[PDB]
Design a protein around this ligand. Structure first.
Ligand SMILES: Nc1nc2c(ncn2[C@@H]2O[C@H](COP(=O)(O)OP(=O)(O)O)[C@@H](OP(=O)(O)OP(=O)(O)O)[C@H]2O)c(=O)[nH]1
Ligand SMILES: [Zn+2]
Lengths: 101, 69, 230, 104, 223, 48
């Protein structure tokens, strides 16, 4: 597997509700994923989910708080006025030096 | 400070900083620095954070203070 | 002869019923560690005390902690409760015996309950176990008075569970060293002492008694009386 | 070879190992486990901290840019890196960034 | 059940090696006493050493005298190793040395003034290649080591005056061991010194300092 | 406390502090006082 789906989807809101094979909806849309919530997806064994993203963001020249979802540094939804782009650019650059090939 | 206690009353960690700065400026302009109390007590900027932690000052009340000045 | 400085500062705060904190300031550099280590060792093992050493539940009937008994507390828990009990021993009596035999039904057990040998005072009302009013059960406690700490080679030897004897009222020292400034020279150390006691004696008085014994020993090679004057 | 050094240690009367029993000075209690002791001949590099303190509060400014001189040659002072500006932007401390760039 | 310790200067050995031993201990207070004695002697002992030396013909430490193999800095280094014993009330004194020998100058060459005692007769201050007149003045005062950071440089009035650092403490090494005789213990301490101060007296002084420090605790008072 | 890039804390011990804890945590099959019962942490500290 290399990466668990729950670990990949952890801290990320769901764009649409997820319907179980039994036909009972498990998670409503626009709900932020949580470690307690993450357990259900493995327990329900849902391998595929749809989550919001910055590319999908409809705001003009801006990022909504929901599309970013969890800040991932304070374990909370990202607060407004935080520069996501600068942090994202610096985080990819710093790890590159350690890696060679 | 940890700013964690201040965060319970205030949200985003930015509005709290702005409110604390305004309160500290108002206190300094209040003539609080007679020089007999500054040595025995901490600086005003920390004092504003302490007042926010007590919650006695009230974030909404602080906005009302700006109109008075 | 610049004249060695004295701490000249004493701070005492009590944050617990038997726990107190002592703070010292203005000590010479490296003085705090030397004073602290000796005081802690003397208080922990240099004080004479009397404590329960051997516990027998049923005339050696109970061989292991696993064995079930007619009460809400397991044998190990009952032994832990008995060890916590503090006993003061009369000078004439070198040994103390405590009997916990109970025929009562569903009756709470307390330090007041249980007959004791003369010269033994419980000094406390600590709870022991809740009786189930079942089959007859018995408790035997052996009390000895000793100085220093004695280890037990075997936890259980025949019919009694052997326990080591602390033989000291003080249970905790946890001394610490912090930096202090007395002026241009700031190398002077600051010492804080936290002491917890069974409550048989006050912590400050016990610390003073521990300090006196070290002073008493050097009386032959040093004049203690002249040092007091100042 | 190691065997010759071991024979030399035996001639000295030390045990055939580098580690030896030691006692802590403060408590005088021996540490569990023996500790190797060696001369470890050492040298001091020419990097004194006396000239590196470089404490500056107010200094003369460059005539062309009206900006502080650097390197400690006169009053020195620390240049602020562009990357440091990126870190300040990530922090969101605009008031610190604005004040440092203009008044400072 | 009362035991009181006694001091015996026994097993003296070496040029300056002594093993003070106490026959009586409290059966467990011996280790604490040994640790206290070891710590107090090393940092509490006060010794008197030269702090200032003035050469007859020098303007600074970095100068070369005529017909002298030793350098002025080298002469200062030889002077520092010199061991001095002083009277209790002397506190401070000045030593004058003048020699016209064509051979090697020595610490014993120092004038035999009252109070001043030079243990290191063997150590040589300087060596003279050819016959010449050599004189210098060294100031001796009682002092103790308070650490490098807390050290006063010392004022110099004469142009020729040169500041010299001095190691006041005289105890090179301190060792202690504990033997239990059964119901009691005997404390054995090995002390190595320059020989300026008798070992038993030094041990008594260290114990007295420890007792003075512990005196405040029993009182539990500021004074 | 946590890295901005990742949730993992950056304040964890790196070298010797971890080694001492690892050495203390290790257990020995045979040791003096083995099988002893201590009511509280203070009693164990006094025994040590
Ligand atoms: N050693 C240590 N101490 C900590 C740590 N975290 C907090 N403290 C102590 O707790 C106190 C909390 O300070 P505040 O800022 O007022 O409270 P806050 O942490 O909840 O915001 C501080 O006191 P202070 O005003 O800084 O000085 P003091 O009162 O400790 O002497 C600090 O010393 C830590 O990780 N290690
Ligand atoms: Zn968006």
């Amino acid at each position: 597997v290399k990466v668990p789906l729950v670990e990949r989807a952890l801290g990320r809101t769901l764009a649409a509700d997820v319907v179980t094979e039994k036909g009972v909806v498990l998670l409503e849309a626009g709900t932020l994923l949580d470690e307690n919530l993450v357990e259900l997806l493995d327990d329900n064994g849902i391998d595929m989910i749809k989550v919001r993203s910055p590319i999908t963001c409809k705001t003009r020249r801006g990022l909504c708080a929901k599309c970013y979802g969890r800040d991932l540094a304070r374990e909370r939804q990202v607060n407004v006025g935080e520069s996501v782009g600068v942090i994202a650019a610096q985080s990819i650059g710093e790890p590159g030096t350690q890696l060679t090939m | 400070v940890t700013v964690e206690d201040c965060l319970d009353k205030v949200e985003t960690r930015f509005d709290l900083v702005v409110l604390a700065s305004m309160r500290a400026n108002k206190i300094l302009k209040n003539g609080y620095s007679e020089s007999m109390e500054n040595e025995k007590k901490e600086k005003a900027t920390v004092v504003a954070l302490r007042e926010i932690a007590e919650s006695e000052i009230t974030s909404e009340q602080i906005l009302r203070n700006e109109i008075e000045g | 002869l610049e004249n060695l400085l004295h701490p000249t500062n004493i701070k005492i705060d009590e944050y617990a019923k038997n726990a107190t904190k002592f703070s010292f300031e203005a000590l010479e550099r490296g003085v705090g560690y030397t004073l602290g280590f000796a005081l802690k060792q003397t208080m922990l093992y240099s004080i004479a005390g009397a404590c329960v050493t051997s516990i027998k539940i049923n005339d050696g009937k109970v061989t292991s902690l696993e064995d079930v008994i007619p009460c809400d507390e397991t044998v190990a828990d009952i032994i832990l409760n008995v060890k916590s009990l503090s006993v003061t021993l009369a000078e004439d009596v070198e040994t103390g015996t405590i009997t916990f035999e109970l025929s009562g039904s569903e009756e709470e057990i307390f330090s007041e309950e249980a007959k004791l040998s003369e010269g033994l005072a419980i000094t406390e009302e600590v709870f022991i176990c809740s009786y189930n009013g079942g089959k007859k059960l018995k408790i035997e406690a052996k009390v000895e008075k000793g100085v220093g700490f004695r280890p037990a080679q075997d936890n259980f030897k025949d019919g009694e569970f052997l326990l080591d004897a602390t033989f000291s009222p003080v249970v905790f020292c946890d001394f610490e060293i912090k930096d202090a400034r007395v002026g241009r020279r700031t190398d002077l150390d600051k010492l804080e002492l936290n002491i917890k006691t069974n409550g048989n004696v006050n912590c400050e008085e016990a610390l003073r008694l521990a300090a006196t014994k070290i002073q008493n020993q050097l009386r032959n090679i040093v004049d203690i009386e002249e040092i007091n004057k100042g | 070879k190691e065997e010759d050094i071991k024979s030399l240690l035996k001639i000295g009367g030390f045990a055939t190992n580098g580690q030896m029993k030691l006692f802590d000075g403060r408590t005088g209690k021996p540490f569990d486990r023996h500790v190797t002791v060696g001369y470890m001949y050492m040298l001091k590099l020419d990097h004194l901290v006396d000239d590196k303190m470089h404490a500056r509060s107010t200094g003369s400014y460059s005539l062309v840019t009206q900006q502080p001189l650097g390197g400690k040659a006169q009053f020195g002072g620390q240049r602020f890196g562009e990357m440091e500006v990126w870190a300040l932007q990530a922090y969101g401390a605009a008031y610190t960034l604005r004040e440092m760039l203009t008044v400072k | 059940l009362e035991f009181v310790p006694n001091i015996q200067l026994k097993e003296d050995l070496g040029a300056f090696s002594y093993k003070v031993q106490l026959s009586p201990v409290e059966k467990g207070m011996a280790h604490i006493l040994g640790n206290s004695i070891r710590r107090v002697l090393l940092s509490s002992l006060s010794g008197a050493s030269i702090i200032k030396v003035n050469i007859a013909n020098v303007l600074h430490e970095y100068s070369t005298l005529e017909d002298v193999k030793e350098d002025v800095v080298e002469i200062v280094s030889n002077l520092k190793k010199v061991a001095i014993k002083l009277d209790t009330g002397i506190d401070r004194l000045d030593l004058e040395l003048s020699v016209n020998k064509s051979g090697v100058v020595s610490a014993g060459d120092f004038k035999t003034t009252q109070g001043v005692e030079i243990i290191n007769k063997d150590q040589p201050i300087a060596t003279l290649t050819n016959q010449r007149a050599f004189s210098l003045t060294a100031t001796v005062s009682v002092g103790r080591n308070v650490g490098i950071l807390s050290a006063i440089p010392t004022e110099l009035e004469r142009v020729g005056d040169i500041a010299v650092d001095a190691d006041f403490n005289p105890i090179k090494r301190v060792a202690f061991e504990v033997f239990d005789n059964g119901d009691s213990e005997t404390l054995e301490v090995f002390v190595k010194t320059n020989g300026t101060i008798e070992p038993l007296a030094a041990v008594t002084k260290a114990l007295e300092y420890f007792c003075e420090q512990i005196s405040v605790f029993v009182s539990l008072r500021v004074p | 406390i946590l890295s901005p890039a990742s949730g993992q804390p950056i304040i964890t011990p790196t070298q010797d502090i971890v080694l001492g804890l690892y050495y203390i945590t290790r257990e020995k099959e045979g040791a003096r006082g083995e099988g002893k019962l201590f009511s509280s942490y203070e009693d164990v500290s006094r025994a040590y």
